[PDB]
Each structure stands twice: as structure tokens, then as C-alpha cells.
Amino acid sequence: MNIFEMLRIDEGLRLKIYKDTEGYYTIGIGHLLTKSPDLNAAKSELDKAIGRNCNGVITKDEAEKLFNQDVDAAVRGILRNAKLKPVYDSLDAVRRCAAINQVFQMGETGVAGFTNSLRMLQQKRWDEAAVNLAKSRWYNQTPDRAKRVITTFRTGTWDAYK
Ligand SMILES: CCO[C@@H]1CCC=CO1
């Protein structure tokens, strides 16, 4: 198991534009296209992302290319985030994957909301962190995925993805 395999399980792979759990146009392996309700706007974003006129459909290789870019961007975003970087750097490799997963899904806008969870993670108070992480819109809206990610944060093992 590694971050790519983990996110591939959590995000799936679809080659046609679809709506994500939040109702937003997405393609590939969880590549968000836009929050616009206009499918044409999503198609424009797709064509821009791929560099050709796709009319809402891509290949597996193209999906994997977006996925590589998105994982890279998520990790690098963590390192550029003054709140996230020290916590991320404090973690072992498996728990780092949990952090990348959560950022991939949620982005960085809600970081301040996770101030207490982040502190508990940096303190290595794993059971306490796991309890706190579940007290969230994130958990309530995607509980099966959040349970897997939280188990990963709690244990530093891949048990939830076996
Ligand atoms: C989604 C970014 O906020 C943090 C990062 C990983 C752990 C808790 O939430």
C-alpha cells in the first residue's frame, strides 16, 4: 500500500464526467473539475486540464496523469502550509498518507477547523486525535472513507485498506 493505491481505493476511477459526493463535476481518480452546476463549465475545465477537446471523456492514462499531478500538488500544498507542515513532518510515513488523503479530499480551506485534531496528531495522542477527527462534517458526510483515514491516523498501519 502507498498513497496512490490508497486514494485509488477511496476515489475510484471513472473515465466520464460524474458528480462527486458533494454533487460537483469530477473525472478520473477524484479530479474535481468545478463547483459550477454548469456541465459546459466542467467540460471547459476538463479540456484545459488535458490540453485537447475531450467532450467529457478521458483515457485511463489521462486519468492517471491528472492523479499524479493532484497527489503532487496536495503534498506540496501541505509543505507550503504553515499550520500543516510541522504536523506533517512530525508524522511517520503511513500517517503522512492519511494527511495527504484528507487534504486531497477536503483541500486546505478548513484547516483552522482541524486545529485541535492537528495538535493531538503532533502530540502523538492517537486515540484522542481519532475521536476528535470524527467530530466533523467530513466524518458525517463520508463516514466509511473517514473511518478508514482515521484508522490510518490512529494506528499508523494500513489495516483499514487490507
Ligand atoms: C484537511 C487538512 O486539515 C488536516 C490535515 C490532516 C489531518 C487533519 O486535518
Swiss-Prot record:
UniProt keyword Hydrolase, yes or no: yes
GO biological process: cell wall macromolecule catabolic process; defense response to bacterium; peptidoglycan catabolic process; viral release from host cell by cytolysis
Effect annotated for changing T26H: Facilitates transglycosylation more effectively than hydrolysis; covalently bound substrate
Effect of T26E: Complete loss of activity at neutral pH; covalently bound substrate
Induction / repression: Expressed late in the viral replication.
Reaction catalysis annotation: Hydrolysis of (1->4)-beta-linkages between N-acetylmuramic acid and N-acetyl-D-glucosamine residues in a peptidoglycan and between N-acetyl-D-glucosamine residues in chitodextrins
Activity at various pH: Optimum pH is 7.3.
Record family assignment: Belongs to the glycosyl hydrolase 24 family.
Protein name, UniProt field: Endolysin
Species this protein is from: Enterobacteria phage T4
Gene: E
